[PDB]
Amino acid sequence: KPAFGTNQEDYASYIMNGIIKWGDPVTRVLDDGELLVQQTKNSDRTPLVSVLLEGPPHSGKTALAAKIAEESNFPFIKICSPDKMIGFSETAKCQAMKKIFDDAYKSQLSCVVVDDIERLLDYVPIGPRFSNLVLQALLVLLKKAPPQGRKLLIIGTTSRKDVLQEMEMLNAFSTTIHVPNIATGEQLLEALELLGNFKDKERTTIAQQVKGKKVWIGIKKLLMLIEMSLQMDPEYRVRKFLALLRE
Amino acid sequence: KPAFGTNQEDYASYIMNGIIKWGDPVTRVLDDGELLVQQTKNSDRTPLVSVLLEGPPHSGKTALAAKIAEESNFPFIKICSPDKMIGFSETAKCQAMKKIFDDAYKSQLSCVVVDDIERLLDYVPIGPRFSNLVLQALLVLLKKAPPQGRKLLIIGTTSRKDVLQEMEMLNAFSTTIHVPNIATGEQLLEALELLGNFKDKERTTIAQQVKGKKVWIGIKKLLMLIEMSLQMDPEYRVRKFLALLRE
Amino acid sequence: KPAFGTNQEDYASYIMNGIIKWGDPVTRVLDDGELLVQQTKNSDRTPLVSVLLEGPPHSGKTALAAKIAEESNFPFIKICSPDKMIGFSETAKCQAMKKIFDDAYKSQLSCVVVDDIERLLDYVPIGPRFSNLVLQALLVLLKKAPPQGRKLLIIGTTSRKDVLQEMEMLNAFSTTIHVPNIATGEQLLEALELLGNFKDKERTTIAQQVKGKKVWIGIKKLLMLIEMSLQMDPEYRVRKFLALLRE
Amino acid sequence: KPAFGTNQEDYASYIMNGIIKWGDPVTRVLDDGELLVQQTKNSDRTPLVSVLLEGPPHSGKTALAAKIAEESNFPFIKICSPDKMIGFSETAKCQAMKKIFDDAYKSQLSCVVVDDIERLLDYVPIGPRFSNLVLQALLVLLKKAPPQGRKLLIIGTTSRKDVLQEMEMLNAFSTTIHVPNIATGEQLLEALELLGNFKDKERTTIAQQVKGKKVWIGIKKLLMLIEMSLQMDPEYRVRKFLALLRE
Amino acid sequence: KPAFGTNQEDYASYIMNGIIKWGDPVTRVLDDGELLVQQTKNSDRTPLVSVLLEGPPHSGKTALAAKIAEESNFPFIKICSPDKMIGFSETAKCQAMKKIFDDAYKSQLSCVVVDDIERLLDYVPIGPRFSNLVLQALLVLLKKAPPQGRKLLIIGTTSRKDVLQEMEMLNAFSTTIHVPNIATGEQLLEALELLGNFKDKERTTIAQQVKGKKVWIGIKKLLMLIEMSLQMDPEYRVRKFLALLRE
Amino acid sequence: KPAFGTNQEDYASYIMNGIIKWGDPVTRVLDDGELLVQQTKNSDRTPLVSVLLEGPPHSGKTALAAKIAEESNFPFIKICSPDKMIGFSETAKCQAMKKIFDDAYKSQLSCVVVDDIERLLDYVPIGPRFSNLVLQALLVLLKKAPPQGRKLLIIGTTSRKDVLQEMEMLNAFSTTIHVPNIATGEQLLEALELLGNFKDKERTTIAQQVKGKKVWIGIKKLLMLIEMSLQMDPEYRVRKFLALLRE
């Protein structure tokens, strides 16, 4: 248990492979986040600010949300994660979630990350089915101002903005930030360079196949394809990589 | 615990940014509310009066309901809010809600605000799903006259009048008051002036873009767009504001 | 707790604004009710008699049912009302309802009013949803003869005859009595006169606008429109009344 | 608690207005019932026999089932009625129902009446909804032979043969007996005569209006219409009767 | 409680009217069953063998399954029947069912009959509705090999092969055996002869009406029609029989 | 209970009839599995690797998953199987499943097999119905990295890749490996040879009927058809085999 009104998060587990600048959108996400941190800390009109980072799966939403939170330097920073509520009933999740906000309210400046909203709400498109009790708790928490004078920045992440819109959750968030997949051959080459896994000859081959072209892959997904490619004999790593990227 | 048959609400949390007269509808809402307060206090025929303030999200329904209640000067004034029932089961909400009315009945003149009906009922359009037990309790409470001779003004708020109509709740309310978003450039300029955030040169620029035109934004939403605009460098505040207002 | 096999109801709360003879249907309802009371008390063939008073909302069903019951002069008269089962689970309602009939069976002559069937059954058209356990208990209670020799008149009220028909409840009731809204300008003028709220000049103005015409408003609703009209300056009371009546 | 393996039912409550021979179908129902009683008592091949008496509501199903049971003269005769399970959960009903059969199995010759199957199963056409646990218990009980050598006649009644067919319950019953409403003016006149409520002049008038014609009314329903007619002044009893019969 | 790893079933209750050879399919069912018993006892590759006996209702599935089991002469033979789980919750059924298999696993050679799968699963076509917990337990039990070296023959019965297929249960059974209704006049005459209920003159009459023709009736159903026919006066037994067989 | 951070599985029960090389796909499955084991043990970027083995029912998914796990030689190897959760409620399954991963996290190198996902999730296509609580727990567990520095290979198996895709589970798995049924006469002949059940003359006959042709049968299913064929008289084994294979 941390000091009263404080909390230091373990960003290592949420950003295990860093934050590489593979393209302009990465900088845009971080800059927009810092502006929201600025607004939260300095505003009396809007002491409660919430933002939803959303994009396709594996695009890097969680790590970016954790980075924005980390850069806020707020006394209280906590990440509400589903991997800490495995098997939890609706009530159990609401109590756990409510506890986090209760502790946040004790700090003058706090930031709470509500990560992977779809999992927190136990959503599944078949039906669909989901925990309405948890959804309702979240809709209220997103609009509950901390006690007078104290500020709170809520950062949510999701790969299903569409579902959250149907649930009326978008009306609860102050704004949203799109977290895109790598979309161009250039951005893809930049990522590979910053990650440094292939030799120039290999990157050249890849480049010939992707430069000036369009791709669609999340940074987290790219990490896996690379690692799978590296298990091949040196002479087949590139072939494997392009094949995986292809299908 | 307050004195028997009494209760003083903390209006500061429900009206954190005041009540500015950005347009005629604001005065209309307050005046209609005072007439209902008058009817409640003076009538023997209709000792129970209920009104639903409804309009688009962020239009200022809660603050206006809290203001009408505050201006009643009734001995007992209580706001039934969902942010005090987070994670609550249907039964728990009904008991909490029933307690409030029970205490209200102890006063000769009382006013109860049932705020954000959609959240109180755990409503979600997917399904849809909602707490019928809570809906039923509310339908009965809306028609239950306080013990003989005592008066009660019930003020509800909602951003989903359509849903409440389907639930037959409109037949329970005595009347309804529409709470509109700011709808004209003039009303928008008036709001900015009363809030005093931009310089004349800036308001002039904005005016050139909105005067004699139509807009659609809730006062609560406007506060957020302004505050977000203020984080920009002086030379780009207006550009940001119009862009946000645009999309 | 009342004397064994007895119960005196508090008709004041169910008939707070009397029973005015605004039109022939009021007399028809009371007369049909007295005939059913007569049949119940005098018949050996049909010792159990049930009747459903139904009509549009606010038409005066409850007060009329309470009046019919009151005029029976039976030793045991009890009104089963939803405002005494707020927040109740299905089981809780069935037990409460079953208790009332159990006590009624102890009297030689009893009358039980099952008021606002839709609320007792927790009905909502979305779904729809309702308490089947309560519906089933009611279907059985409506056909359960008191112990040999004893009589029971069951009077139900509802604003949703259509729903009850779908639920097969109409096959349970012995007969039904329609409780209509005020339907003609004449009946409307008669009501205003018997209630005595407007001056002759005013009633004359209203008459010019409604006499020889058709209207559709429940007596309970009319009381509210009048009371709202009375909050206006003398010179605008009539204008307000007709406007409210209009929309 | 009755003697081991025995049970005497109170037929008075299930046949409060006797069994009048208003038409051939009444005799047909009783005769078919006695044949099934005969088969049950004398057969080694089919020691378990079940029959469903079904027809429109109010046609006299329960009283006829109770009469067939009474005429069996079996040591154990028990009527499983829903008015003894008001408010019961599915489990509670199954236990109560299972208890009855358990006691029946203790007798060499037993007869169990499962009355008003729709109510026992908590059926409602909206949905529809019903207690599947109770349905399943009944489907199994209908096919469970008493312990070797002992006989059991199960008599069910229902006004919804169609619903029971959908539930596959008809495959469980050995056979079914139709219990029709009074269908001809002759049968109607015979009923009135056997009940002796109108004077010859009156029956003559009625006859002129119904003889050689077709009608459709259950004996239980007829009893109520007559009794309602008898509340009128002598000169209007017939008019009332035909009017009620008409609509 | 029987000896460890053993269990002797009471086949009398499951085969109360024997196993008559009314036609070739009866022999086919028994022969196929003995081959499966042979495979189970002798195979190391498939120590777990399951078979579903299925056909129309009343065709004799249970008695035939009980006969196949009886003829296996296995040390452990147990019939899992729904008439021993009346009113049972899903969990209760799974525990009871799991207990049986647990005991079977203790024997070197065991046979478990899972009778009337539709009832075990609380199936009803309206909805439909059924116990998924029980279905899941059965799907797993059908594929769980007894502890190494021990054998188990599972025999299921059902009148709804179609439903079980939709539930994916057919992929769980090793094979299926069809249990048909009596289908020809010849088979029908053979049954009557083996049961010996009618006189030659009578069988001759029946023969004239059914020989060289097609019929469709389950042996269990035939037993009931015969027994019902025998309640008639000698001169009308045949007439009754053909009438019943007709409709 | 095994040593801290360790666990040795009993592969005998999951691979009771070995792993025969009936065709190239068998080698492909094992080779792809070893590459994933290699990646898991050697990578710092992707310390958590998950793979779904999927294909038609009876194709050999479980045994192959168990073989891949066995060949990893990891200190901790555990198979999460539904036959150890029979009758389990959603919560019970989640706790049991969560326990396994918790123990796995204690090892530097672990492999967890989540076998037969459809059964673990209590899936049934009618509805459909399934345990969402279990699905949600699995979606989170599939993405939860073991504590820093430790590796985990998760291997799932399913016969319903389509259902898992709808449930969004495919986005959770790192990759998938298809486990096909035997598809050619050649592969079928190879299987029979490796299993050694028929004589050359017999295999020759079969070959004449299947060589250069296409078939579709899972290895587990083939084992059963063979064993059933072996119960026939020597002269009819082949006839039986082809007949079974045919339909």
Ligand SMILES: Nc1ncnc2c1ncn2[C@@H]1O[C@H](COP(=O)(O)OP(=O)(O)OP(=O)(O)O)[C@@H](O)[C@H]1O
């Ligand atoms: N610019 C970047 N933005 C985000 N993540 C990055 C970046 N550069 C490297 N990474 C690494 O990529 C991974 C991103 O995975 P993360 O779990 O954040 O994705 P996600 O979109 O939240 O996934 P999911 O859709 O599964 O929720 C982390 O290992 C992170 O350190």
Ligand SMILES: Nc1ncnc2c1ncn2[C@@H]1O[C@H](COP(=O)(O)OP(=O)(O)OP(=O)(O)O)[C@@H](O)[C@H]1O
């Ligand atoms: N004229 C006004 N009417 C209402 N609110 C006003 C007005 N002028 C300023 N405000 C401020 O705007 C905010 C209105 O937000 P409020 O929560 O009342 O809106 P709402 O419509 O109830 O929101 P929601 O749709 O989220 O329920 C408060 O901060 C309030 O003080």
Ligand SMILES: Nc1ncnc2c1ncn2[C@@H]1O[C@H](COP(=O)(O)OP(=O)(O)OP(=O)(O)O)[C@@H](O)[C@H]1O
């Ligand atoms: N003739 C009348 N019949 C009925 N009520 C009357 C009559 N004259 C005056 N009233 C008054 O009108 C009101 C009728 O309201 P009541 O609650 O009975 O209506 P309702 O139709 O039962 O309402 P709801 O639809 O809300 O259930 C009572 O205050 C009653 O005293």
Ligand SMILES: Nc1ncnc2c1ncn2[C@@H]1O[C@H](COP(=O)(O)OP(=O)(O)OP(=O)(O)O)[C@@H](O)[C@H]1O
């Ligand atoms: N021939 C008859 N058959 C049946 N009931 C008769 C007959 N003659 C008179 N009665 C009387 O009519 C009434 C029949 O009502 P009963 O409750 O048996 O009908 P039901 O069809 O079971 O009703 P429900 O549809 O409500 O279940 C009883 O009072 C019974 O004594």
Ligand SMILES: Nc1ncnc2c1ncn2[C@@H]1O[C@H](COP(=O)(O)OP(=O)(O)OP(=O)(O)O)[C@@H](O)[C@H]1O
């Ligand atoms: N050849 C036969 N096969 C099966 N049952 C026979 C045969 N000959 C006589 N019988 C008798 O017929 C009856 C068959 O009924 P059983 O309960 O087995 O049928 P079922 O198809 O299982 O019924 P249900 O569809 O109700 O489950 C038993 O009394 C049995 O002894």
Ligand SMILES: Nc1ncnc2c1ncn2[C@@H]1O[C@H](COP(=O)(O)OP(=O)(O)OP(=O)(O)O)[C@@H](O)[C@H]1O
């Ligand atoms: N090459 C092989 N691959 C897989 N199983 C094999 C192979 N050769 C022989 N077998 C044997 O075939 C059986 C395969 O059955 P298994 O339970 O693994 O199949 P499955 O596809 O998982 O079944 P289900 O669809 O029922 O889940 C085992 O007995 C296994 O030892």
Ligand SMILES: [Mg+2]
């Ligand atoms: Mg994420």
Ligand SMILES: [Mg+2]
């Ligand atoms: Mg509000």
Ligand SMILES: [Mg+2]
């Ligand atoms: Mg009423």
Ligand SMILES: [Mg+2]
């Ligand atoms: Mg009946």
Ligand SMILES: [Mg+2]
């Ligand atoms: Mg059977």
Ligand SMILES: [Mg+2]
């Ligand atoms: Mg498997």
